[PDB]
């Protein structure tokens, strides 16, 4: 029994984290086979960052300007190039700890584990959702750029996030590992803001199923509803639309608990319209939306990784 | 910026997890140097749930009754001994991945990470606190026994918890790595029930200091309190007493924020009285008690 916000075991990614220095700037890199990946903004001074020309800044650098430390060992940079907003540093040695891995770009609503790192050294691991507004509500201090986000699918690490910056509201923005930003953001010091965010409806539902599975059942009711009626309610409360695919994805949870997705939707309708009336669900007084359907099944079935 | 329930990176513990089988029972073991640690109830049969005599069950076992699998590899058991409620299986290979480590018994309110595992393989990592009633609010399925809790301090892993059982209320009980149970619990299936649980007041206060550090001040007020008046109020909300030790421990965070500890206590008293009135604090609509003073300083710097 029990239900916790849970990250993937982070060992396979810890073995890939290195320190990357360029001039006065230190941040983290991801060392896989013989390439170290990191944010291309590592090459900027504070004035460069105001309006960088990255290709120009880069051609003036050469390999020896990139100091890469793996633990206490130096790696030799033998090539450098950019792909979108990530720098790729070719090094003279493949990472003997390279896991089975893929670069995957995730969808808003999907969750992943962040391995927060400082000076190449892993400091903490936590679970994030990619918000509908393409930010993440991370926890990062200066030095954390280049920390990565990932999922594990059997024994394959799917890397999905590299940290690049913090926005003025204190939420975080970054790229996939091919350096495409999530969201309408750019790597430069200019005025940027998170858009208004919404709540991830299918995840809230998954979490209600998790609550039922763990014995927390007070919010269930005799009613059911339709997608169209419920989606009207979601719109009014700044919830994402629920699609048939979401209903399909929640299928197993509906068969297992005896609460149909639209039966649950009627519980959620009532919760949005009336609140919790002093009660909690799985220990929370607000509706949690950072567990996917897959997260809830995984944790309530005990799947493992090697 | 940001504030998250964050766990320690788990890789140093992952390379210590093994599967231990005795009879028809499989659970997890922790392999450090040439010893595998696991709950002694792995030797119980369905008859031995209620009043097992562990010394009598163990003397009947030989080394080869214990199967220990590390990844794909069988380890050879060359010795066994019991210490309190843990079994220590001596094996013929020292773990090459053994980290720097120590065994530390923690006090209620302390936090630690748990590497949940099944069949010797890690499932997930999350953050827990030792509740005042010596249980933990974990996430454990059948087959999770022998999963461990830990902190990591400058590459040294301090193992503080081994998972033994789930109580009827859904909360969890276990031992330190010397095999002594936290709280009044025993490894028998006889009805036992956790003390009424209470909120970890010193941690809530730390977390309110984290909220101020991250830019949030709406819940402060112009008042202060004596320590005794605070405790008189807070125990009516099932809050643990705040001690002068706790007041001292909050000294650094008070200094950093400029809010005296007893002034923060006054803000907490009002919050218990008023609720949050539809506001949130660090993204929560409840007061959070699973961050220690030390956690807050490490996460906020
Ligand atoms: C001088 N400077 N530069 C930044 C910045 C902005 C966006 C990105 Cl992606 C990376 C860094 C913040 C400050 N203070
Ligand atoms: Cl302690
Ligand atoms: Na219903």
UniProtKB/Swiss-Prot annotation, chain B:
Stretches assigned to the Cytoplasmic side: 1-301
Q: Which residues form a coiled coil?
A: none
Q: What is the effect of changing residue 205 to V?
A: In strain: Zeta/P.2
Glycyl lysine isopeptide (Lys-Gly) (interchain with G-Cter in ubiquitin), cross-linked positions: 5, 90
What does the UniProt record report as the effect of altering residue 145 to A in this chain? Complete loss of 3C-like proteinase nsp5 cleavage
Its UniProt entry gives the catalysed reaction(s) as:
TSAVLQ-|-SGFRK-NH2 and SGVTFQ-|-GKFKK the two peptides corresponding to the two self-cleavage sites of the SARS 3C-like proteinase are the two most reactive peptide substrates. The enzyme exhibits a strong preference for substrates containing Gln at P1 position and Leu at P2 position
**Where found?**
Host cytoplasm; Host Golgi apparatus; Host nucleus
Q: Which residues form the Peptidase C30 domain?
A: 1-301
Task: Look up the signal peptide feature and give its range.
Answer: none
Q: How is its activity regulated?
A: Inhibited by pyridone-containing alpha-ketoamides compounds 13a and 13b. In turn, alpha-ketoamide 13b (tert-butyl (1-((S)-1-(((S)-4-(benzylamino)-3,4-dioxo-1-((S)-2-oxopyrrolidin-3-yl)butan-2-yl)amino)-3-cyclopropyl-1-oxopropan-2-yl)-2-oxo-1,2-dihydropyridin-3-yl)carbamate) inhibits SARS-CoV-2 replication in human lung cells. Inhibited ex vivo by michael acceptor inhibitor N3. Inhibited ex vivo by compound 11a and 11b.
Can you tell me which residues form the catalytic site?
41 (for 3cl-pro activity), 145 (nucleophile)
Its subunit composition reads: 3CL-PRO exists as monomer and homodimer. Only the homodimer shows catalytic activity. Interacts with host FBXO22; this interaction promotes the proteasomal degradation of nsp5.
Q: What does this protein do?
A: Cleaves the C-terminus of replicase polyprotein at 11 sites. Recognizes substrates containing the core sequence [ILMVF]-Q-|-[SGACN]. Cleaves and inactivates human TRMT1, preventing tRNA guanine(26)-dimethylation of tRNAs. May cleave human NLRP1 in lung epithelial cells, thereby activating the NLRP1 inflammasome pathway. May cleave human GSDMD, triggering alternative GSDME-mediated epithelial cell death upon activation of the NLRP1 inflammasome, which may enhance the release interleukins 1B, 6, 16 and 18. Also able to bind an ADP-ribose-1''-phosphate (ADRP).
What's the protein name? Answer: 3C-like proteinase nsp5
Organism, scientific name: Severe acute respiratory syndrome coronavirus 2
Q: What part of the full protein is here?
A: 3264 to 3564 of 7096
């Amino acid at each position: 029994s029990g239900f916790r916000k849970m990250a993937f075991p982070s060992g396979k990614v810890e073995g890939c984290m290195v320190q990357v220095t360029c001039g006065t700037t230190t941040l983290n890199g991801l060392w896989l086979d013989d390439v170290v990946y990191c944010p291309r903004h590592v090459i900027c001074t504070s004035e460069d960052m105001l309006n960088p020309n990255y290709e120009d800044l880069l051609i003036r650098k050469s390999n020896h300007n990139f100091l890469v430390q793996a633990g206490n060992v130096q790696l030799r940079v033998i090539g450098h190039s950019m792909q979108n907003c990530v720098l790729k540093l070719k090094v003279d040695t493949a990472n003997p700890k390279t896991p089975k891995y893929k670069f995957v770009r995730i969808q808003p609503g999907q969750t992943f584990s962040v391995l927060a790192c400082y000076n190449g050294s892993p400091s903490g691991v936590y679970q994030c959702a990619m918000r509908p507004n393409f930010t993440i509500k991370g926890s990062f201090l200066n030095g954390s750029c280049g920390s990565v986000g990932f999922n594990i699918d059997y024994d394959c690490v799917s890397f999905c996030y590299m940290h690049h910056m913090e926005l003025p509201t204190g939420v975080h923005a970054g790229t996939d590992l091919e350096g495409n930003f999530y969201g309408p953001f750019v790597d430069r010091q200019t005025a940027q803001a998170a858009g208004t965010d919404t709540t991830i409806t299918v995840n809230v539902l998954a979490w209600l199923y998790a609550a039922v599975i763990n014995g927390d059942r007070w919010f269930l009711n005799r009613f059911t509803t339709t997608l169209n009626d419920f989606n009207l309610v979601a719109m009014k409360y700044n919830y994402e639309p629920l699609t048939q695919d979401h209903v399909d994805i929640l299928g197993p949870l509906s068969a297992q608990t005896g609460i149909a997705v639209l039966d649950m939707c009627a519980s959620l309708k009532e919760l949005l319209q009336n609140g919790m009336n002093g009660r909690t669900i799985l220990g929370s007084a607000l509706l949690e939306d950072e567990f996917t359907p897959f997260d809830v099944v995984r944790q309530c079935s005990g799947v493992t990784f090697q």
